[PDB]
Amino acid sequence: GSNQKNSPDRVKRPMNAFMVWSRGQRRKMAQENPKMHNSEISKRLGAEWKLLSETEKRPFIDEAKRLRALHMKEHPDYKYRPRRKTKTLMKKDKYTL
Numbered sequence: 001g002s003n004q005k006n007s008p009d010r011v012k013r014p015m016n017a018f019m020v021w022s023r024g025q026r027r028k029m030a031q032e033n034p035k036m037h038n039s040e041i042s043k044r045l046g047a048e049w050k051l052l053s054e055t056e057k058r059p060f061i062d063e064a065k066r067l068r069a070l071h072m073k074e075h076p077d078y079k080y081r082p083r084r085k086t087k088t089l090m091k092k093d094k095y096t097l
Contacts, residue, residue: 020064
């Protein structure tokens, strides 16, 4: 075949509370609604946050704050391993009527 070492796309930059929760809801919306395309799952995410209660985010935001704080320091003795196990694995080919 060919020689593929690296991979497309890249993850970096800080994040917000919405990301802390969305990440947790995505797994649920994916495992429960795997047929739902990303574009669809996203529309429900961004919208869910708009209706999300300040109290619900209270805990979420607190988590994001720590993440952003870690990036600010970007200490030398602080690295992370590559997270590669599964993307989604869908088995469908239908959008709308």
